[PDB]
Symmetry: D2
Subunit: 262 residues, 4 copies
């Protein structure tokens, strides 16, 4: 707990990266839960296992008789933590749609965001409820150009767009990873201004690469166990360290906006 | 070079953490070089091997017949990269001073900063030149309270204080590590505002722990070989990434202020 | 460009004036509406909300709209119109002309009033070809989101659009012209202050809104806008970077009308 | 508070006025000098630089100094003295009295003129017990460092001190009262804007310095300082947080005299 000498303290935050991830994904799951108003479903299909998809699918098990996660990456089966959730890779779903009858969801949720599922694939369903996650955060022309959320809202008797922002703060996307990074970065900025702090370390890395380039979910989850922030200071900063992090986590606001249509 | 899909790019900065470290330590070494005005010395003693001390000691070999690094941590002998530099731990030095004649430096440089060498030990020398690195950066009451740089300027015919700041930007200390962290953090914030960037990763960790808690200099040097920043974006940002990092490195200004009398 | 307290320090006032930033923002909003309207011609356009972009937006409609009427709840805002080609009606005069007469039947309705503005009830009294409602929400804020009712105002019109205005890469709480101008200037000041040799950086800001709505003096308000956005104290020349930073922040404003789909 | 454009939006003017922030800052500088002087009494104090902290600092010296004189190169700055117990001299009148008369022989000299101010040559004409020079440098800026000559002004006096003023954890380019007031208000505005329900946040700023030095109108300047520092447009009440944020940023100002050995 000392640094280079006993004159300096090293403090690692109690809040871990996985704790921030958990808070964000829980907010998204609760936003969906609120939108669905306790409606029960026979078959839910959720596109996009990483990063919030896993927990969102878990949260649907109560009111959905069957919950299926679909991901173009077969190795993301490893990111599911409950066995009640069925996993299908995109080729398996598309095959089952073409030469089968078992796929006819009354709830469809697209969490894939930028460069994700095609409106054509969504158009193959006729659910009671369709939710599309809007990957756009605050304004960025380049991201707006590549977004096609509105084109994906092409089926369903009830339609919603899942939005996630940080109150009073700028983030480029609504993605769980983006929000976690931005929470940590903003927290570091304020922590560094605490009296006696020498420097403030965000324990960040390109976690996305661990999942999608190394294709190592186990390692990714281990990486999330790290303290979010490590601080070097002369005086104790334990309590303010957690207070600043928790405050920035609390700014995340997730909600489904109903999209009107007949 | 793609991310989750081919619609998103992943870009790793060409500038590595060690490159930023190198730039900062070079500025400190050059600040000392300028202050010394080409004066030649028989024996230089540098306190504090980590983080700039190693290169600073190297830079003194030209004009100093003997250059000795002293560190309270014996394992920091591993952070010296030239064989021309002699290493002594604090115990070995303090003993050679009491019952020896081999230690009589005409150049003394204290790079230890916060919680470092005592003024009592500095007072045991009588060099031509004394340089003390001021660990204080911009204003912080807690850091000012523990600093005793001025009390260490107690010997030497010529006295100087090595200061390092970032032009127009706030940093809590002049330490190489602090400056590298702050360069990367400020660069990340500006990079994130580039059009089409989704998020911006500073490839940071508690490197100091690797050196002083794990006592693994080799691992530490390996950790520095990492790209400073990794970006997720829709469009190419390769050149802007380097421009922003380079600009923030260039804000570092290191200089020795002469302490009169 | 002059000296400060002594000739060792320079005082630089920006060439860009507050009114120039206002102009650029209101022009972007007007052009967003223009693009949405796709050259359609209209017999009668009614624009709710004269301040701050309404005056110019209404003027920009004159080309394709035979008659353009600005409606504002504040009668003194008649003073904020550019010329006589736009008709001004206070809210009371409109609501009376709606009840007694046939002269009010717009085929284009634009609501620019934003927070606490026109009621969905009043909008529902029209049956235009096109309805545009300005969304006052900027980036995320719970308190502003809670008081906004933009979606409830989109209750008439064969074609419906929502006018949105944000700053690329930067946070603003609303899309209001005033908010955006303030934030442009504030973000510019923070970057200008970091220029080498700057001592301090003054945003030439005040509560301009009060001049319009509390003092009720539009002429004074327009005079207040005819002032350099920023004044800088520095050792060295900063005139060029000063304008470049302001111009860059102005260019981040992005205004567009998002079509609100309604098949029925 | 009052309503804004409609009764759905509120307008809040801060209770803290610009003049209150000025007062707090100049008081901190005066107390820094007070602490440095350790209750020593003086026969004649000369303070160079009436604007902006000089007026109050001179007032604060009346207690322990039999005579207090403010010297300014601008004769109209006699108007910024609020106490008649303080004597005013323009620079010409002083230099003439130094060359011919004998009435000028201060035992306390304080130079508050900072950038482009009094010359070391003029300071060298005195032989006080105590010399204090205000260091105008704030945090690091190369252009400002290059024009500063504070150290060259510390050329007389049995006891020498440098008056420094910084903001804890925050960046300011100078120690000037005006710079600090501006930066306090600007940093407060940034944080206030992030309060829930705030639409926009107005710093009630203008180029006050011009009112004093270009319009040469101290009366108007003092009236200009009698405005709320910040005006906020918001949906919900923010009055409590508005004052707390301003007060917090004021409290970051730290002024102290460093003894020059
Ligand atoms: N066409 C497609 N069909 C199914 N899954 C897809 C897809 N394209 C991408 N995906 C998956 O969807 C995810 C995209 S990343 C989604 C991140 C999410 N918005 C969050 O906040 O966490 C990845 O798991 C990716 O493998
Ligand atoms: N009393 C002492 N004698 C010698 N070395 C000491 C010491 N106290 C601390 N040290 C060493 O001095 C260094 C302190 S860290 C110095 C950081 C430096 N300012 C920079 O910018 O890189 C460490 O290597 C530590 O082990
Ligand atoms: N019910 C109503 N009818 C007509 N005008 C109204 C109104 N309520 C408010 N207004 C007017 O609408 C304007 C609100 S301020 C609108 C700001 C605008 N969004 C911009 O970006 O500039 C004011 O001129 C106000 O007087
Ligand atoms: N050579 C000189 N002799 C006397 N006064 C001078 C001078 N040069 C400048 N001045 C005066 O000194 C002041 C410089 S401004 C000083 C600001 C001060 N540091 C603060 O914190 O408020 C002005 O009043 C100016 O008129
Ligand atoms: C939001 C998002 C996305 O929809 C697609 C992608 O490749 N990356 C991100 C960023 C993130 O995951 O945070
Ligand atoms: C500090 C200072 C100064 O010494 C000289 C000058 O012209 N301007 C300033 C800035 C200020 O007054 O804040
Ligand atoms: O005008 C602004 O920028 C802020 C908003 N003020 C309001 O009262 C209503 C806006 O729609
Ligand atoms: Li020598
Ligand atoms: Li952008």
């Amino acid at each position: 707990n000392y640094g280079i000498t006993e004159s300096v303290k090293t403090t690692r935050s109690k809040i871990k990266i996985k704790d921030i991830v958990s808070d964000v994904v829980e907010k998204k799951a609760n936003a969906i839960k609120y939108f669905l108003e306790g409606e029960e479903f026979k078959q839910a299909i959720v596109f996009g296992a990483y990063l919030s998809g896993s927990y969102i699918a878990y949260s649907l098990l109560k009111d959905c008789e069957e919950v299926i996660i679909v991901d173009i990456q077969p190795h993301l089966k490893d990111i599911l933590f409950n066995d009640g959730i069925k996993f299908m890779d995109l080729n398996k779903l598309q095959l089952e749609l073409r030469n089968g009858t078992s796929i006819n969801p009354d709830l469809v949720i697209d969490l894939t965001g930028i460069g994700g599922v095609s409106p054509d694939l969504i158009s193959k369903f006729n659910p009671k409820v369709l939710i599309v996650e809007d990957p756009k955060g605050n304004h960025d022309k380049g991201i707006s150009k590549i977004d096609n959320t509105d084109k994906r809202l092409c089926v369903g008797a009830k339609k919603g767009v899942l939005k996630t922002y940080r109150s009073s703060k700028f983030s480029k996307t609504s993605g769980t990873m983006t929000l976690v990074v931005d929470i940590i970065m903003d927290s570091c900025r304020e922590i560094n201004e605490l009296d006696s702090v020498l420097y403030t370390i965000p324990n960040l890395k390109y976690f996305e690469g661990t999942v999608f380039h190394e294709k190592n979910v186990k390692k990714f989850l281990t990486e999330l166990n790290m303290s979010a922030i490590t601080v070097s200071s002369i005086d104790h900063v334990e309590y303010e360290l957690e207070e600043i992090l928790s405050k920035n986590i609390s700014r995340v606001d997730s909600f489904v906006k109903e999209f009107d249509k007949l």
